[PDB]
Design a protein around this ligand. Structure first.
Ligand SMILES: Cn1nc(C(F)(F)F)cc1-c1ccccc1CO
Ligand SMILES: [Cl-]
Ligand SMILES: [Zn+2]
Length: 288
């Protein structure tokens, strides 16, 4: 009856290599970047400016009035290196094998782009640090990450070279809307998906979580995550891994890198993935 012959990683791999599985959507969160040294900051467990309410450091109005706290925090939090993980390059391999329909990401850390996913491949649901824009509606001059980095480390508040307005990283602040691309792509992609690969997200933040209920009822959904997630909340189309009615949802519990390695091994891609990661990491390590 069901597309998966068994509710295991092996069943998912067999399905992926069957002619039935042509279009994969990845939904990813902070768990795919922790092994790169990027901490999960939506986690309250990780991490003077006289804010009227602390969220003002991420609220667009306060930023526009008092941007210095945000850029001081950005200097403190700036990564020492931008090296994507095995998981990121697994998605690049999906792209190379012609299986990747779209990667929806909650992360702003740019590692999807560094790993070789193109803008067309990506829905950065919470924005990105990869580009920044002048905040003046009549200008909107775009600046790359290197320019913003120089400004941040020199502790100069970044101003537009054309109009001297503030320049803001393209992350979604409080009081801003989610990008229209998120809804536009969701409405089209989920008519087309054969497999949902959910990696490194607890599916707790909305509307990003509700994406899993946009899949067709037959579409298998594989969670690769440290903890099970996405099931219906006993208090309030959720994941069903374990009931007798379960038919399409699979949980692989562990680090995202190790799960992607296990899946690649099942697919016969482990050598390809190892070679890609080793060469890309070497290229990043060698940046002079
Ligand atoms: C520099 N910065 N600043 C912030 C903020 F201020 F918004 F919190 C976030 C980041 C950032 C940028 C790229 C990759 C990873 C991170 C965070 O680990
Ligand atoms: Cl989450
Ligand atoms: Zn400008």
């Amino acid at each position: 009856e069901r597309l998966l012959d068994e509710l295991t990683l092996e069943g998912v791999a067999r399905y992926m290599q069957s002619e039935r599985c042509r279009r994969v959507i990845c939904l990813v969160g902070a768990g795919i970047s922790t092994s790169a040294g990027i901490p999960d900051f939506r986690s309250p467990s990780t991490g003077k400016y006289h804010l009227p309410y602390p969220e003002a450091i991420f609220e667009i109005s306060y930023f526009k009035k008092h941007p210095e706290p945000f850029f001081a925090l950005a200097k403190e939090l700036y990564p020492g290196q931008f090296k994507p993980t095995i998981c990121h390059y697994f998605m690049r391999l999906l792209k190379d094998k012609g299986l990747l329909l779209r990667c929806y990401t909650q992360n702003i850390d740019t590692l999807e782009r560094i790993a070789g996913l193109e803008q067309e491949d990506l829905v950065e649901a919470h924005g990105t640090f990869y580009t920044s824009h002048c905040v003046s509606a009549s200008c909107r001059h775009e600046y790359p990450l290197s320019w913003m980095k120089e400004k941040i480390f020199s502790e100069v508040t970044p101003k537009c070279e054309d109009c001297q307005s503030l320049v803001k990283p393209d992350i979604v602040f409080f009081g801003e809307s989610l990008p229209a691309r998120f809804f536009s792509c969701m409405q089209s992609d989920f008519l087309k998906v054969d497999l949902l690969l959910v990696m490194g997200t607890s599916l707790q933040v909305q509307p990003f979580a509700s994406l899993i209920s946009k899949a067709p009822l037959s579409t298998p959904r594989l969670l690769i995550n440290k903890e099970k997630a996405g099931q219906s909340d006993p208090f309030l189309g959720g994941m069903d891994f374990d009931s007798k009615k379960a038919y399409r949802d699979v949980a692989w519990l562990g680090e995202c890198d190790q799960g992607c390695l296990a899946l690649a091994e099942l697919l016969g891609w482990k050598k390809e993935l190892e070679d890609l990661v080793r060469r890309e990491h070497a290229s990043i390590d060698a940046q002079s």
